[PDB]
Amino acid sequence: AKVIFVLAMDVSGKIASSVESWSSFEDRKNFRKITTEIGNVVMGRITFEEIGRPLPERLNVVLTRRPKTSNNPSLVFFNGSPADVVKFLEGKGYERVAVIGGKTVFTEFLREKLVDELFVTVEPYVFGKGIPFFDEFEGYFPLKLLEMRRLNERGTLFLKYSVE
Amino acid sequence: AKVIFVLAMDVSGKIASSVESWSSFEDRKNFRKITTEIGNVVMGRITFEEIGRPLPERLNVVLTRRPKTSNNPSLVFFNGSPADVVKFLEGKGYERVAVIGGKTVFTEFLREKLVDELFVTVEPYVFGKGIPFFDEFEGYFPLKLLEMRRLNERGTLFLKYSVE
Numbered sequence: 280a281k282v283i284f285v286l287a288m289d290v291s292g293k294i295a296s297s298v299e300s301w302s303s304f305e306d307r308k309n310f311r312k313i314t315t316e317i318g319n320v321v322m323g324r325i326t327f328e329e330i331g332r333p334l335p336e337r338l339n340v341v342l343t344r345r346p347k348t349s350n351n352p353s354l355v356f357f358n359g360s361p362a363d364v365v366k367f368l369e370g371k372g373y374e375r376v377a378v379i380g381g382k383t384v385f386t387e388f389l390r391e392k393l394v395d396e397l398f399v400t401v402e403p404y405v406f407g408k409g410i411p412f413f414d415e416f417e418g419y420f421p422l423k424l425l426e427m428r429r430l431n432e433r434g435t436l437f438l439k440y441s442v443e
Numbered sequence: 444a445k446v447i448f449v450l451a452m453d454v455s456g457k458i459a460s461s462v463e464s465w466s467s468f469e470d471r472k473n474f475r476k477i478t479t480e481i482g483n484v485v486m487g488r489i490t491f492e493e494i495g496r497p498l499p500e501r502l503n504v505v506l507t508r509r510p511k512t513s514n515n516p517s518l519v520f521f522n523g524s525p526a527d528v529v530k531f532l533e534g535k536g537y538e539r540v541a542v543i544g545g546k547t548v549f550t551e552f553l554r555e556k557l558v559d560e561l562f563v564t565v566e567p568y569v570f571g572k573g574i575p576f577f578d579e580f581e582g583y584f585p586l587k588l589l590e591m592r593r594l595n596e597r598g599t600l601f602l603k604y605s606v607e
């Protein structure tokens with residue numbers, strides 16, 4: 280399956296800050312549309328706790344070293360490496376895997392080179408402080424821009440890159 | 444005069460990395476046009492050394508605490524706050540000031556809220572390590588997207604933002 284990263288950030292590359300509601304209405308609807316199409320989302324435990332509940336119409340895979348039994352078929356607490364995660368979803372018939380976050384989770388998939396496309400939303404802000412897209416890692420990735428789209432009047436931008 | 448930031452970065456927000464030749468010539472020509480139109484470039488001493496010499500047809504203002512007299516009329520070593528630099532250039536009839544870089548210089552101008560527009564080029568890469576656009580500072584800036592332009596088939600993107 281191909282791995283797709285889905286994230287929103289400010290112009291400086293941060294995925295979280297203390298700025299209230301900087302995430303646009305448009306990015307939120309675009310996010311639901313994209314991830315439901317893919318049919319699954321892989322996230323870190325901390326990101327799951329912030330969302331608070333499983334996202335509807337999608338298989339929610341939550342990474343945690345303290346797996347918890349689940350009563351919901353669309354919620355799975357998983358203890359494994361990025362590679363293990365991809366194998367598990369592939370075994371479910373998914374062609375694409377949507378990794379939606381946790382700086383920690385983005386970092387792990389990057390260190391392991393498991394990323395084929397980046398669906399990036401750039402919100403019109405500059406945050407002086409915040410949580411970076413990922414922690415330092417050796418190497419880099421050349422990209423190719425597949426699509427660019429303005430999502431609203433203020434300038435929220437949706438970019439789609441393929442990893443070369 | 445209004446302060447304009449001109450920078451190129453990868454998708455993760457870094458203005459420099461160990462990767463060779465990641466700067467596109469299209470960005471370089473676009474940079475040449477914009478900065479010569481503005482007529483001046485304000486930069487940190489390190490950036491100056493890396494460029495290798497005064498950029499032609501532009502007043503080059505090199506920020507430094509250890510000032511050196513200059514023979515060249517279009518090269519000035521300046522010691523002072525970002526506010527003093529603007530004052531100095533305004534006194535010379537400039538309406539716009541082009542701050543072209545150095546993580547330290549961008550940080551200083553941001554801390555002082557002296558910035559009106561951002562002329563940002565996003566090169567199609569993700570760097571694992573590198574120098575960030577700026578070091579932490581208090582607050583943030585909401586922006587409005589004025590213009591978006593693709594510079595090459597690979598995906599180099601030029602974005603123009605207004606502050607606040």
Ligand SMILES: NC(=O)C1=CN([C@@H]2O[C@H](COP(=O)(O)OP(=O)(O)OC[C@H]3O[C@@H](n4cnc5c(N)ncnc54)[C@H](OP(=O)(O)O)[C@@H]3O)[C@@H](O)[C@H]2O)C=CC1
Binds near residue numbers: 288358359360384
């Ligand atoms: N702007 C955006 O688009 C997004 C922003 N975010 C933001 O980023 C922050 C979250 O980032 P971050 O805290 O780094 O990461 P996460 O919070 O998403 O998850 C961290 C945790 O996930 C678990 N985990 C990670 N990797 C593995 C693995 N290989 N195996 C098992 N468990 C694993 C661990 O859980 P345990 O401790 O249980 O063992 C770890 O504590 C939040 O502020 C959130 O708002 C999140 C998504 C998107």
Ligand SMILES: NC(=O)C1=CN([C@@H]2O[C@H](COP(=O)(O)OP(=O)(O)OC[C@H]3O[C@@H](n4cnc5c(N)ncnc54)[C@H](OP(=O)(O)O)[C@@H]3O)[C@@H](O)[C@H]2O)C=CC1
Binds near residue numbers: 450525543574
């Ligand atoms: N991608 C891009 O668009 C750009 C990338 N860069 C990259 O970023 C790096 C440069 O970042 P960084 O080193 O932080 O900064 P700079 O290299 O631009 O400048 C550092 C210097 O500027 C001087 N300086 C800074 N603030 C002041 C002040 N308030 N008053 C007086 N002098 C001051 C100091 O001079 P002194 O010590 O002599 O007194 C210091 O040595 C380089 O690797 C370069 O390649 C640079 C520009 C653009």
Ligand SMILES: CN(Cc1cnc2nc(N)nc(N)c2n1)c1ccc(C(=O)N[C@@H](CCC(=O)O)C(=O)O)cc1
Binds near residue numbers: 379
């Ligand atoms: C905090 N968080 C993480 C979050 C937010 N925006 C993002 N935006 C992008 N582009 N990418 C991400 N990974 C991302 N992650 C959240 C919080 C809520 C919902 C959420 O309610 N979900 C609805 C969205 C729908 C709405 O507002 O209709 C969904 O069903 O997908 C998703 C993610």
Ligand SMILES: CN(Cc1cnc2nc(N)nc(N)c2n1)c1ccc(C(=O)N[C@@H](CCC(=O)O)C(=O)O)cc1
Binds near residue numbers: 451474478494
């Ligand atoms: C390392 N450096 C800093 C540099 C490079 N690209 C950037 N690109 C952007 N968008 N913004 C910056 N601040 C920036 N800074 C350099 C190195 C050379 C020249 C340079 O030769 N100058 C010619 C360009 C000429 C060409 O290729 O015709 C110029 O007249 O501006 C400029 C900046």
